[PDB]
Amino acid sequence: TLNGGITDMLTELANFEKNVSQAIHKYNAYRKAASVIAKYPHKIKSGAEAKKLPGVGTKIAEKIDEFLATGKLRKLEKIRQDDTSSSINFLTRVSGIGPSAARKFVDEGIKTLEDLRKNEDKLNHHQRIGLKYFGDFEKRIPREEMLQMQDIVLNEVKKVDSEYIATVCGSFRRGAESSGDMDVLLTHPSFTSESTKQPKLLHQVVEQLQKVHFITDTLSKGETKFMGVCQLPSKNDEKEYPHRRIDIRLIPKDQYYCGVLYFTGSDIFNKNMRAHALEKGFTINEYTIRPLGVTGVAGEPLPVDSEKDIFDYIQWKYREPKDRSE
DNA sequence: CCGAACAAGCATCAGC
DNA sequence: GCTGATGCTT
DNA sequence: TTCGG
Ligand SMILES: Nc1nc2c(ncn2[C@H]2C[C@H](O)[C@@H](COP(=O)(O)OP(=O)(O)CP(=O)(O)O)O2)c(=O)[nH]1
Ligand SMILES: [Cl-]
Ligand SMILES: [Cl-]
Ligand SMILES: [Cl-]
Ligand SMILES: [Cl-]
Ligand SMILES: [Mg+2]
Ligand SMILES: [Mg+2]
Ligand code: NA
Ligand code: NA
Ligand code: NA
DSSP, rough: TTTHHHHHHHHHHHHHHHHHHHHHHHHHHHHHHHHHHHHHOOOOHHHHHHHHHOOOOOOHHHHHHHHHSSOHHHHHHHHHHOOHHOOOOOOOTTTTOOOHHHHHHTTTTTOSSHHOOOOOGSHHHHHHHHHHHHHTTSOOHHHHHHHHHHHHHHHHHHHOOOTEEEEEEHHHHTTTTSSSSSEEEEEEEBBBBOOSSSHHHHHHHHHHHHHHHHHEEEEOSSSSSSEEEEEEOOOOOOOOOOOEEEEEEOGGGHHHHHHHHHHHHHEEEHHHHHHHHTTTTEEEOSSSSEOOTTTSSBBSSOOOOHOOOHHHHTOOOOOOGGGGGO
């Protein structure tokens, strides 16, 4: 964290633009700037120095000069004073409350945590569970707990069907010492891009994890993506572990490598790689890499037999998961 | 100058 | 009900 | 807000 003050400032600006201004491109620009500065291996001495990095333009360069001179950004100082901005920023911290609902809640006088708790019947299901576990979902998961969670998930999936493969992705697969949640990629030979030979493949796994009281709540659930809540079991007389967000993604087995690339991330790494794919004439999603035709319409999926194959297509040298934490 | 900026699953809603 | 747009999320 | 053509 050579430049943690700068990257925190840019992250706070990004969140302001997303949550309050609902300006998604500004949000992305600030986040890209913070990510490129975060990996820059020198302590930044001037905006001009920072402007040399891709993603830092004139306006962010100027803010970095103000920050280095004074330790503060007046723009941010005033955003923190604004009650409506501060209200909206808080409400979006609840899972399921985004920029639109936060502002809508604002027009109704429902601001504080106390307000939300009094008006549970104004919340959809996702928002209600996000409020229920508001405190817990702000805590990080130590890697040691991620390992215990991995063991439960993999073993419970094995008990349903030994042919399932469950892989923990996200920051865990990138080797992080702590994670914000648990991301589980799931495959089964019956589900490929060619056929679905078994129904309920994701459901059966969700059900088993509920039976053993690992999964405790559901935020959303369809045939290939589960979003919910889990909790490690605690010993006698021990305080309970925090409840944790879990995401499970069932991916066609023949498309595992595109799937595990997507689900390992980071999010900014994915955006950067997909942007580069487009410049190289390809489009990458969690399923396939496809060439872009002369008019820019995706062609047919290219053959992929490793994560590295995807990097090769777009002429990037391979990056291990630990080096994708952008 | 100015168009593009990653891609998509699930929940919800409007309109038919 | 279906379709398509939108919100929220990964 | 930034970049690329
Ligand atoms: N193309 C894209 N892909 C994405 C995007 N958002 C998330 N993802 C992908 C990449 C993430 O690693 C993966 C998990 O998403 P998660 O939010 O859990 O991110 P972690 O890397 O695990 C940080 P942690 O706080 O959870 O520890 O989902 C996206 O906008 N666009
Ligand atoms: Cl914008
Ligand atoms: Cl500040
Ligand atoms: Cl693949
Ligand atoms: Cl596809
Ligand atoms: Mg995660
Ligand atoms: Mg571009
Ligand atoms: Na730059
Ligand atoms: Na939120
Ligand atoms: Na996640």
